[PDB]
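Annual report, structural modelling task.

Input specification for the zinc ion complex:
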Amino acid sequence: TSQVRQNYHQDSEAAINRQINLDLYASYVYLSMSYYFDRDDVALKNFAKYFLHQSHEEREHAEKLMKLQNQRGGRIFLQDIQKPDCDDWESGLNAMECALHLDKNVNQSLLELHKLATDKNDPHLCDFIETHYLNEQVKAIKELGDHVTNLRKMGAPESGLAEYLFDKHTLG
Amino acid sequence: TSQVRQNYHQDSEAAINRQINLDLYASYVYLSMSYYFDRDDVALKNFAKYFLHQSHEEREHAEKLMKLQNQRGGRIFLQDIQKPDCDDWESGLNAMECALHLDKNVNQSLLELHKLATDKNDPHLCDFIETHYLNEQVKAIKELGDHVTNLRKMGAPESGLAEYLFDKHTLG
Amino acid sequence: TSQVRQNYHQDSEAAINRQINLDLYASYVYLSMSYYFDRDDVALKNFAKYFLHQSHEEREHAEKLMKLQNQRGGRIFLQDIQKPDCDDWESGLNAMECALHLDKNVNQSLLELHKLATDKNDPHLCDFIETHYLNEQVKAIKELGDHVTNLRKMGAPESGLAEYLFDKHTLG
Amino acid sequence: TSQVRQNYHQDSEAAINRQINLDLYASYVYLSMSYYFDRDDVALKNFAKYFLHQSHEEREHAEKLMKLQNQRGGRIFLQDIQKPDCDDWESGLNAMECALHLDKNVNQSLLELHKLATDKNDPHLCDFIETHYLNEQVKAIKELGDHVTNLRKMGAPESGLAEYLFDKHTLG
Amino acid sequence: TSQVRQNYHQDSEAAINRQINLDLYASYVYLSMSYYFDRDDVALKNFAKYFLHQSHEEREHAEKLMKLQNQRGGRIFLQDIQKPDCDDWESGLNAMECALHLDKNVNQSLLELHKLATDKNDPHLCDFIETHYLNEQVKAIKELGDHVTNLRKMGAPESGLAEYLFDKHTLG
Amino acid sequence: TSQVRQNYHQDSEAAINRQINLDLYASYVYLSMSYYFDRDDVALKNFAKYFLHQSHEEREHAEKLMKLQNQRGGRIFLQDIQKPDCDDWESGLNAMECALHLDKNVNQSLLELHKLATDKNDPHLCDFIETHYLNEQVKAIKELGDHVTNLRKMGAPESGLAEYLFDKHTLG
Ligand SMILES: [Zn+2]
Ligand SMILES: [Zn+2]
Ligand SMILES: [Zn+2]
Ligand SMILES: [Zn+2]
Ligand SMILES: [Zn+2]
Ligand SMILES: [Zn+2]
Ligand SMILES: [Zn+2]
Ligand SMILES: [Zn+2]
Ligand SMILES: [Zn+2]
Ligand SMILES: [Zn+2]
Ligand SMILES: [Zn+2]
Ligand SMILES: [Zn+2]
Ligand SMILES: [Zn+2]
Ligand SMILES: [Zn+2]
Ligand SMILES: [Zn+2]
Ligand SMILES: [Zn+2]
Ligand SMILES: [Zn+2]
Ligand SMILES: [Zn+2]
Ligand SMILES: [Zn+2]
Ligand SMILES: [Zn+2]
Ligand SMILES: [Zn+2]
Ligand SMILES: [Zn+2]
Ligand SMILES: [Zn+2]
Ligand SMILES: [Zn+2]
Ligand SMILES: [Zn+2]
Ligand SMILES: [Zn+2]
Ligand SMILES: [Zn+2]
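The model returned the following structure:
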């Protein structure tokens, strides 16, 4: 038992390790999405930049959870980072829809982690999740919903004009 | 009778109280419109910002009339602020049409107030209305008419592309 | 169901709408109080400025809750904003006592909203209330209590000297 | 009953008074440790500076809890501040071990206070503890653990060279 | 015997330890007084600030004596810091009267310490006391006397107006 | 076939995808190493910072190869990123030895990729590898060798003093 460990349940430690993997996975999905939009036959530079930004953020989230694990005297155990479900993301709209679905999955995991912390009477962990993650997640989900709505209203994915203009006027 | 009161008719005092309520109502309508455009399934940020600006302006108008009432030795009596007629404003174009109709209603009230002031030989009140309100109202009505025209010509409300581009290029 | 909605109970959505109305009501009460102190037969300019500041803050609170409602995929429903209970607020002391009572009522509502969020296992909503509102409310209530105490000790409301000096030395 | 008091349980009020005493005690322990390292036959200036910093911080914590007690309408009751268990702290390593043990005791108290606040449905108090204290405490405990580890690995307490170099390279 | 110790009598060493405790006690009394004036039913912010300043100064005095003890090769022995005689300090005037009495008690102790140093032919200790403490103490006592006089002349403690205005015009 | 593709062999495209995976793996190994040194029972902050820097660099390498793949009209196919061989890295020295071995493995892969490019008469790819990667790799390997030598000469891993001082004087 770590000399620093206090009020830190085994289950919480395990759940933090799983959340580290999921954040890294989410980083990987966004990395794949980013370079899809970098292909010469897709060529939406600001969609590419947008997803690369999300990729780096998810990596930073994982790093912050790795720091938390050590702060509380838990031990980090890393797992393979699974390749994303798609190699080809179809269109700007489809990628935004996929991002939205991903972010709600990550959100569900965070909410389950918060519930566990509550159940184990770990107010430090509850506070960590609420402060660093919950509102960020809500904001990301709202932003992706907004983007999906605008793309649909503009006539995406069938209108390549719509995705081009959105890339310029919203993501640029 | 207030020690400051001079040449200030009872009817004028009453009409000022009614105009305070109407300006507050107009503030409320614009507040409702603003956050409609903030919904994830509408997602026109500059339409939202535009109407929030109008909301605050209408609130400032009411405050300035409350100051006038006290300046002249009248007594402010506040009434309930009625909820707007709609919860869902339909489209950018429809909201601009509704705004236009509202502003002409407020204008009619201001013009009736000015007529009353004229009828009661209250040149201070005539000057107050002419200086603070009449030209502002004419400008707002012209601007909203301009916006309605551009949205219609662009193909709104059926073209979600039209409302998107207008949001970016005129309201942004 | 909104594409963004997640872990957001119907009851929470409804309670947020009620809190929006109450914050707007509180804005209205403070607006009425402010211009009472602007009357020529009251003439306490810093009491007027103090309450106008509270009015605007309460309006900002409502706007922030309207943003939250949209962030979570809820739908804003606005209700009439009731006129305050008084047109004449009596004295600086009486207005401060009324403000204190109002702020504790708003606080009770916020605490009930937080309890609901807890009961519905909505840590994002718990965090929103705790972070934006609870400590602000506690501080406001403490400040109003302080002001009431000083006014009473100075000899208010019977001493117009007391309210004059307080206006200058505390609120100025 | 204080005019400001709301949702503030008697037990919470009492627990805050006890935490004020414990923070003051912790301040006192660190003050004693600091000047031990200031002795001519110990003479580790940065160990002295390190503990004096912790002493002042603990004093500030107590002051902030005294402010909270008044904010909520509780009444501060102060108790004697007990002298620390030791007059002679032995070595840098032993003092760091003692600091670590102290900080975990203070942490346990804070966690029990948070549990009480939760049990009494006092979200303002839960938020106060989580925001001002829990993460600070976790960070302090991690830092002290780090310091203990480095001192042990370097060969402390038997190596006066180890404590000298640590004083220079980590605490300086 | 410390390698640095020279011309430093056992009795002087003991008296320094007692003065350290008394300065810490005085710090504690002023801390209690400060937060009394922070209560919502007292609410004199500058009385609160004034006493908090005295609290910190007394703490600094103790720290400087702890440094002296080590400088001369004496050994610090800390004792419990007794809670102050009152939890409720009554009024601004009564607190200033209590402060005055406290400062004269601390002064008497300092003068007895100086007499001891003289009796033990310790000119370094005589100089330390004269330079760091005696004139500071005389100035504090004169200031508190001045404050008591002004509060009494203004009509304190019965005039809450007097204490309010003094808080603003002298302590602010 | 991509409209941009020219002189880009299928085998080269495949080898680039494998190198992307290996760079990401190397990023992951360094990430694991970094937070090992962040544990409270290891507590070498500059070893932690050093490996985190290498992690980010390897990620940037992968991103640059993903850009190259698109530049040449190849198609990125991502694979799982395998967890590192160790969860516990033992000591600073052992981690530096592991880093050295890893970097020579990555170097061997880069050299095989360069040989393939040469065999397929792809001077653009030869130039890309030589310019972005080969000299960087040689420098990293030399640096890690230097670090291993200094740690061994200082008495690592048995001397915790050696690893502490190296952390301060070389990595700090
Ligand atoms: Zn983030
Ligand atoms: Zn990073
Ligand atoms: Zn797999
Ligand atoms: Zn929390
Ligand atoms: Zn929080
Ligand atoms: Zn205007
Ligand atoms: Zn205003
Ligand atoms: Zn109605
Ligand atoms: Zn005119
Ligand atoms: Zn354009
Ligand atoms: Zn606020
Ligand atoms: Zn606003
Ligand atoms: Zn009504
Ligand atoms: Zn919370
Ligand atoms: Zn702190
Ligand atoms: Zn302080
Ligand atoms: Zn004792
Ligand atoms: Zn909380
Ligand atoms: Zn001093
Ligand atoms: Zn100090
Ligand atoms: Zn006692
Ligand atoms: Zn002398
Ligand atoms: Zn590089
Ligand atoms: Zn990058
Ligand atoms: Zn595997
Ligand atoms: Zn070449
Ligand atoms: Zn070259």
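Chain E touches chain C through eleven residues (CB under 8 Å).
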